[PDB]
Amino acid sequence: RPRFSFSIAAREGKARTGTIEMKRGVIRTPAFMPVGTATVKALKPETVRATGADIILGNTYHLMLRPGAERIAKLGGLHSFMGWDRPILTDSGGYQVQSEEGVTFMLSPERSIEIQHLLGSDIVMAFDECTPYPATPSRAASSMERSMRWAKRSRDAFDSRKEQAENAALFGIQQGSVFENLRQQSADALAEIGFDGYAVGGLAVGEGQDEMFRVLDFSVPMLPDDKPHYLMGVGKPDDIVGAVERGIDMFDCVLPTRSGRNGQAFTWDGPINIRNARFSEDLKPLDSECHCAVCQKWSRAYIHHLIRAGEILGAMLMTEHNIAFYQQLMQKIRDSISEGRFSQFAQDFRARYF
């Protein structure tokens, strides 16, 4: 397999479906990347794979604090440490964490790229600043411009490390808040540097779905068509569907994991909160169509009891179902685009989910 190859197999409107080939595996797009600490909280890596995940997001910020990037490198890298042998996309650390050098809390672009190398990342994110929302045109500009300088520094750091350059991929991140002109400048700067993939940053930060979609409408076409498009931090099932309708290929969110241990279960009829008394004697599975192991074997009533009781097994089961649900959503999206019926799928999905 190559270091990195993105191929688009089918299209519908702005939506695309295809594959990213990398040395550690193939990634089906549009892709949902479960987020970890633990490939995913409360799941073994084999269970994460069983749900259909092709790639996971590695939480750099946590790992760089403990056990430490250098320690993980000494122990053989994050894949070996965790027991996940497929691709890992690492975050830069820069959302969870100010000067032109970087952020003191020193995390600079060079140190971020180095930490991602030490973990053994397959897809490395450039170090940026997620501009707060709302932002004035001035602040958004200043922020975006710094991020583009940091993007160039990221590129050079990555390229100056042979083993990283030969075996990993590097994504750049577009900024510019909600302003079309800044989004364009950013896209232009990133394409001049050149990356393997392009993220849309600076969204899912308080603006709401209507505004997020409006910005996606003009921002995604600015990115190179022939490279994957990653929407950072998104999101709820309806947000994913709409983003795919606007040309996004990749997603990450802590929602399924977070919400799960919370008691929220995703279903094709919308989310349910399994702690509700209404479920205490409900023998149906979390969702009537879901193919996951949890829906094959346990009832709402059981999981209701476990979550109310604060049982670890409740978190395990809720998380496995919710990650499986997201994977099934991505599979339905891929299949519908492949078959030229994604517009209809989006309409049917929303009709029932809401």
Next chain:
Amino acid sequence: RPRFSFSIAAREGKARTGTIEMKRGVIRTPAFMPVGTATVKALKPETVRATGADIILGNTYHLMLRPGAERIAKLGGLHSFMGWDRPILTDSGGYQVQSEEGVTFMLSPERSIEIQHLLGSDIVMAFDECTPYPATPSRAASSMERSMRWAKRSRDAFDSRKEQAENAALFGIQQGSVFENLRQQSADALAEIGFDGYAVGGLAVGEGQDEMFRVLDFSVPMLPDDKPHYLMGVGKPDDIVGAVERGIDMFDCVLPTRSGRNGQAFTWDGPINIRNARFSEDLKPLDSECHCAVCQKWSRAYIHHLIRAGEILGAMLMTEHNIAFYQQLMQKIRDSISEGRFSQFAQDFRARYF
């Protein structure tokens, strides 16, 4: 399969190995019964089975509080609820929880037997009082005598319920603290009532291993030889080995589960506390010989990090290993008795473990 059949296949001294056949499965003896809430905290039932468990102990006291025995019955019984289709031994509720009728906190022998029926227990424990330690001869006597009256009430309650009598088994529990004469009176009273199996109660309550063993030395021979002998609440690996040397066939303890999530891992070289700094870069498995999935796939260093970080996956992995370790200990015990080399196994085990 029969309702209940205990067969002894081999002996060595007072140690025995054999099988209990029941409608839901076969139980290899000497047996370790993992304890639940969740067949075992942090494990799916398939994982519990994978470790080698033939039977689990169902925590009646917790379940009778929530979700409630009647609710579990309405939902199809504990096996269906939990997803464990093999035998379950239910506790009476009476240790975790005073008049001749029962205990108010009303839990009486009749209500205990009824709750165990409602859960769908395979092996039902008579309702007793675990006499506190130390106890004066008077108090121990009075306590034991009440327990024997409660044993008779338990027997009658069980027998008056056709479906329970035909499909489950009933164990009586010997009391009498550390006094040989009271232990004998108790054994005599239980054998007159007649049970399918006999537990040694009133130990592992502060007396220490030397005294526990001294009491076992005279108490177990008082019980019918042809029925299984259950030592309640025991225990640490060395306690299990010594108890088997004294004729015990069955054990339960929360130690492997409890200790595990605590950071204590059992090994053939003794227990280790995986949170110790000494393990932070140790790439060996928890134990060098253990056949469990955890020791096949993850390092000490990884599990060290997970437990220090408070990760659920740390509890999952520690628990699976520790329950597997106990099952491997019971298998080694069974095999060594079957081969007439259990005395040597006990000596070799202790030499290395200590």
